[PDB]
Design a protein around this ligand. Structure first.
Ligand SMILES: *[C@@H]1O[C@H](CO)[C@@H](O[C@@H]2O[C@H](CO)[C@@H](O[C@@H]3O[C@H](CO)[C@@H](O)[C@H](O)[C@@H]3O)[C@H](O)[C@H]2NC(C)=O)[C@H](O)[C@H]1NC(C)=O
Ligand SMILES: *[C@@H]1O[C@H](CO)[C@@H](O[C@@H]2O[C@H](CO)[C@@H](O)[C@H](O)[C@H]2NC(C)=O)[C@H](O)[C@H]1NC(C)=O
Ligand SMILES: *[C@@H]1O[C@H](CO)[C@@H](O)[C@H](O)[C@H]1NC(C)=O
Ligand SMILES: *[C@@H]1O[C@H](CO)[C@@H](O)[C@H](O)[C@H]1NC(C)=O
Ligand SMILES: *[C@@H]1O[C@H](CO)[C@@H](O)[C@H](O)[C@H]1NC(C)=O
Ligand SMILES: *[C@@H]1O[C@H](CO)[C@@H](O)[C@H](O)[C@H]1NC(C)=O
Ligand SMILES: *[C@@H]1O[C@H](CO)[C@@H](O)[C@H](O)[C@H]1NC(C)=O
Ligand SMILES: *[C@@H]1O[C@H](CO)[C@@H](O)[C@H](O)[C@H]1NC(C)=O
Ligand SMILES: *[C@@H]1O[C@H](CO)[C@@H](O)[C@H](O)[C@H]1NC(C)=O
Lengths: 175, 328, 326, 175, 328, 175
């Protein structure tokens, strides 16, 4: 979309990830699997929940009876009554249709930004200890085990701990 | 090079829900909600928990005047709205004009208290006039000639119509609705056959109301086998105020009044939709609406706190991601 | 390194169109479209393909009554809206009050069927009453004293003004417009000079209509050399219904009635805009609007499926990129 | 404007490129020329065309004659007619003006995303085989002939083909 | 590296201002503005610089007719809008029905010129009629039986009430407001006791106005010790136009007329809010509003160029950054 | 926010910076000090000021007497007047509340975008002459004096001038 993450450099979604909106896919000697980042998914969930409630709860209407009765000699004010009702319908129809046409575009771009940020968070947490193979994936220059993987998902990746191992592996591969 | 991988991606499901954006249309999304309310229960429920006044065979004119067919309809002390049916032709049986009829219908659309009482008891109020022969063929009841229940057609007793002057004081403590009628006979021979005196006048007087009527005698085309006409009039009496009726003929004196307490301006629904025992907070002719959505397309003519009416057919608001389960 | 280069860039042209945004103003763009319709053809066109009714010199009151300057009643025709002019002054030549004039204008604004027929023929309905001397000096027709084309002023035939009772049943199968009038002279001598009796009454009644008219005799300031007044009335009669005229004097009996079928409530345009042969879906006093744009500023008083009126002078919408040459 | 591509790190636009909205300018020993990215250009054209239609084709108005005539004794309801007309005028004038402001800013930012993401596409495709010389341009560390130029555009750039050549070219000037 | 630092950051301060977004609420921002005008000066001020007309204890009906408790205000030169009070009781002391009261108030809301002159002088216009005893107990003036200041109740001069016929032509070149009354006595004895004639009539006629009145005699309920009623009428006279009065009794002849020029339609404020020397361009019953904001929440009833009324209580529009002065 | 700069990779804001919205914090041998970017901040000032005036000054109201008076037999038109008054109230209240909700975050995203662009502006200048230590900060590989600091703030940093010095310190650090 507007950020190029959803349907962008990450071409498709993960039907195998079911616990959240945005998340991770890892692979090591101990196996693989799909896991959703809890904080970012909940951030979108809370924001989108506020998005729906803002549109609905800002509508506050009072008791109103639209029905009006006029006789054969009150046609002029009868047509004025229709002009009021037709005018109100035209305004509300135009606003309601364009409101959804607008906030849906905002909603999709909101998810697009969230995916982009999550990639940037991991990218500016591993630095040169991993290689950007593309499609929103990282290949580790060192060996990232289950403890290492959970650190990345917890935002507590110890770069200097694995940097020396990545230093040797990178140099030998880049020979 | 050890090989371990970590990837970042987004969720996808089997949902086929589509939404529209300003730049794209029919965009499949993982999760969505509907902002448009298009569901109604198809029943006429009770605004504010108050059952409406269903008139059925009659309209408001027949119910308030007491047209024979408009017998026990609800009785009932209050209503949130008045419901007529599209085929309810039992109103004013005797032809005439109902004055300020639309205004009275709006005024009666919702009341808090409603009490019908004998303002002028037939057994004592009219000893010098004939209160029994005042029936007509235009207002049948089980075939026999009858008249409005709440009104009395006073005619000459013997061949004497003495000057009439009876008054009422509002001791109820609420506003009292008083309705009367003025008769306009076809021929002066019919005028003498009914009220003896050929030149009469009718006066109605309150602290705020003062108007005097003079009968207009001429032959009109036969409407319900009647060449005469009968206009209808109504007014409200403030509590503690006196209303005076003075006439020498052609006056349809009231027999029953209505001590009522009014509400804010409600509406009147003309629909065949059945009335069931349900509460609701919004009402439409097609049915009641029970929703928290901000828009609806069921019916523009709503009564109560209701979502705004829109021409929209589908307001699908996306909440999830762009569903991309496979890549070609 | 041969210095081969690949660059990414965007379009630019000679477009000088400027669009305002929430944060910036002007902002020259390469491609834009205007959402506001600000031009009109200056013509009064056929709305819904149906031509309008241009009274021209006359107004509605004169046209329906039949004032001598109001051409004729055309033929069995129809219209989509009524066109008057600011100079349209020929109306009720004899001073009076056209009762419910505003309401009748709205009802007559657009009809799909129309026909003028002589409901009461002049020389076969009023034998006992004079139907030739009922003219006045305030209503000239090419100089001579005359009266409305569709109305007859009945007076005593020498000295005989008996009771009148003439009725008509709506056999046309459509709504029939019946218009009459009540004459109110200045002095009772004028009352005797016209209707013999000094105490007359008029009763007009249909199935629904029931009203009895009494004349008022008093001296009023002269308007077009008339101290008396003449009010005009009208009503609609359902098919298969009888309307009764009953008067002993001071009644302006109808001559030509109108059988018609009404459209939905349309408008009346009062402007000097010429009428040409053209089709449109939106009509304004300034001119016609042939556009699908949602907004306009030509005129707030529109007729038909029209764009919403706004005070905006320009509502240009950006579609291309920011034009940044040099 | 919001992503910094247009009127940003690409200061100006090309008046020579007329076959689209976004595109490329190449230069090698064979020649130069402007070519528009028909893929990204068509996406913006379709979106913007929908954008104009969305605003226009949501105005669902009925037949209505605004003209109302009131006599000299109906001044009160006459003012009510003008209050309705003035109120409708104020509502539509305010909404129409602000709607144009909203979508003009959205349109410009939408173009900014397309230019930014097009640059991101090539940058993530060439990788280190080319040098980011700024102003939205790339300088190849190898012989990128006409066939090589077409590969980047119709994105099929064979990075491994020139990877070893660009590796030696990069180090030579690094001396 | 010879360590040198350059960072990029954003502003923060001690602001506690909170704004709301569609995705987030209670967002503390550095700087913000309030888009909703929520305060007023609490004074009734002068729209377009022109001071309003305040009637105090009197209403428009009492002020335009000249009730004895009225006319103590600052007469009239010109005004932008009319002010009454929640207790403006003193109006038509004699019971009756003021014809087209609401329509007249709309016309009188704003005027450019407004001068009162004696259209029919008392001393030299009614020689055969007694313009001295036309007072009533229902309109006291400090305990003395008085009448409306601008109207004269013409009665018989001993035993003579001839056919009155007086006319006036609009020499002022402006619009002239003329008001007159018709008395409807209780009993027929009261009819001769005041006008010496049994069957009377009243006629008023201009170039456009023409209507005749027949008195309606009947006993109404006592209102301020009055069983009769007096309906008041009004009209406007075009410049250089004759207005003709012709009555044989039961006519309350005009005494004071008003030459005036009407502005565009204005409003009428009914509030106890005091009046001061301030201009304002927006006026509400609660007070005047001087703002350039597009929305307000003071009062739905406004006169002049005013912000649109909303039910909102807070429209805090964010202008600065998100305020994050301390990272926990 | 939406661009990840504010409350993102720059976790908090600077209380010390009081001369603008966005700026820098340098520190060298001579000393340190907060200093706001006088171009981006002024540009943001113009946009937000134009934003407020666009919402405020697009409202165009005329003289109008909202109040109306009706008698005991004009209840029907009286209710129509309230339907116009309440209907206008409901339309404006819904638009006003949602307009603030929509624009508030758009302003917040606007500030988020401006901060990130400023980081990209400096990053595109320093290139490999500085090391991105994160949290919105750069560490120079060479000696940057007060004159050197102003060149970056002026957008005229001379990369070729300090390239050789940064080249030596970069690879000496590697060993
Ligand atoms: C100016 O307004 C006052 C009201 O604030 C008028 O005086 C009040 O008149 C009423 C009505 O006559 C009195 O109340 C009751 O009247 C009835 C008769 O309708 C009677 O039965 C009751 O005993 C009682 O009097 C009220 O007492 C009286 N006085 C006050 C101080 O309110 C006053 O007449 C008005 N003046 C003019 C010139 O219009
Ligand atoms: C109640 O309504 C019915 C019509 O729905 C009235 O009866 C009709 O009377 C008219 C008189 O013109 C006849 O044309 C119809 O054939 C009658 N329809 C019937 C009997 O079904 C009836 O009189 C009305 N009122 C009362 C009091 O009975
Ligand atoms: C995860 O990160 C938090 C701080 O965000 C830290 O307190 C915690 O120890 C980390 N590890 C686990 C296993 O929760
Ligand atoms: C998707 O599959 C689930 C079961 O996994 C089922 O409940 C749901 O109805 C399906 N929906 C669609 C749209 O196929
Ligand atoms: C409606 O609400 C009232 C509130 O008192 C309650 O008593 C009643 O049971 C409800 N009825 C229905 C049908 O919901
Ligand atoms: C741009 O140039 C073309 C070709 O000369 C010309 O037709 C067009 O009008 C120009 N547009 C402007 C000047 O806005
Ligand atoms: C162009 O790209 C398409 C789609 O990836 C590919 O099939 C084709 O071989 C490419 N051709 C060239 C000449 O780059
Ligand atoms: C209102 O403004 C006028 C000038 O238009 C001035 O003469 C008058 O004194 C002002 N009234 C105030 C400030 O109360
Ligand atoms: C600052 O930048 C401006 C604009 O590019 C340039 O003219 C000027 O020479 C620069 N000055 C310094 C001291 O960097």
């Amino acid at each position: 979309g507007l950020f190029g993450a959803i349907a962008g450099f990450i071409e498709g979604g993960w039907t195998g990830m079911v616990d959240g909106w945005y998340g991770y896919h890892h692979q090591n000697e101990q196996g693989s699997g799909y896991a959703a980042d809890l904080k970012s998914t909940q951030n979108a969930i809370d924001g989108i929940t506020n998005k729906v409630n803002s549109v609905i709860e800002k509508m506050n209407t009072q008791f109103t009876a639209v029905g009006k009765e006029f006789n054969h000699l009150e046609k002029r004010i009868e047509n004025l009554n229709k002009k009021v009702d037709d005018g109100f319908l035209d305004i509300w129809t135009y606003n309601a249709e364009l409101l959804v046409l607008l906030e849906n575009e905002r909603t999709l771009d909101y998810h697009d930004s969230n995916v982009k940020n999550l990639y940037e968070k991991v990218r500016s947490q591993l630095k040169n200890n991993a290689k950007e193979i593309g499609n929103g994936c990282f290949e580790f220059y060192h060996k990232c085990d289950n403890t290492c993987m959970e650190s990345v998902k917890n935002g507590t990746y110890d770069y200097p701990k694995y940097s020396e191992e990545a230093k040797l592996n990178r140099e030998e591969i880049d020979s | 090079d050890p090989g371990d991988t970590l990837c970042i991606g987004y969720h996808a499901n089997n949902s086929t829900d589509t939404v529209d954006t300003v730049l794209e249309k029919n965009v499949t999304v993982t999760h969505s909600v509907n902002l448009l309310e298009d569901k109604h229960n198809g029943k006429l429920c009770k605004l504010r928990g108050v059952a409406p006044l269903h008139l059925g065979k009659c309209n408001i004119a027949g119910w308030i005047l007491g047209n024979p067919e408009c017998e026990s309809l609800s009785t009932a002390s209050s209503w949130s709205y008045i419901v007529e049916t599209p085929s309810s032709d039992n109103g004013t049986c005797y032809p005439g004009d109902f004055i300020d009829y639309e205004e009275l219908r709006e005024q009666l659309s919702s009341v808090s208290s409603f009490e019908r009482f004998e303002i002028f008891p037939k057994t004592s109020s009219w000893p010098n006039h004939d209160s029994n022969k005042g029936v007509t063929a235009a207002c049948p009841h089980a075939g026999a000639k009858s008249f409005y229940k709440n009104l009395i057609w006073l005619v000459k007793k013997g061949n004497s119509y003495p000057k009439l002057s009876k008054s009422y004081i509002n001791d109820k403590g609420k506003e009292v609705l008083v309705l009367w009628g003025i008769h306009h006979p076809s021929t002066s021979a019919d005028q003498q056959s009914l009220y003896q005196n050929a030149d009469t006048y009718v006066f109605v007087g309150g602290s705020r109301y003062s108007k005097k009527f003079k009968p207009e005698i001429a032959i009109r085309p036969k409407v319900r086998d009647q060449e005469g006409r009968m206009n209808y009039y109504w007014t409200l009496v403030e509590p503690g105020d006196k209303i005076t009726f003075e006439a020498t003929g052609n006056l349809v004196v009231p027999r029953y009044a209505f001590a009522m307490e009014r509400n804010a301006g409600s509406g009147i629904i003309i629909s065949d939709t059945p009335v069931h025992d349900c509460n609701t907070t919004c009402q439409t002719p097609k049915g009641a609406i029970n929703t928290s959505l901000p828009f609806q397309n069921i019916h523009p003519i709503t009564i109560g706190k209701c979502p705004k009416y829109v021409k929209s057919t589908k307001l699908r608001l996306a909440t999830g991601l762009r569903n991309i389960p496979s890549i070609q």
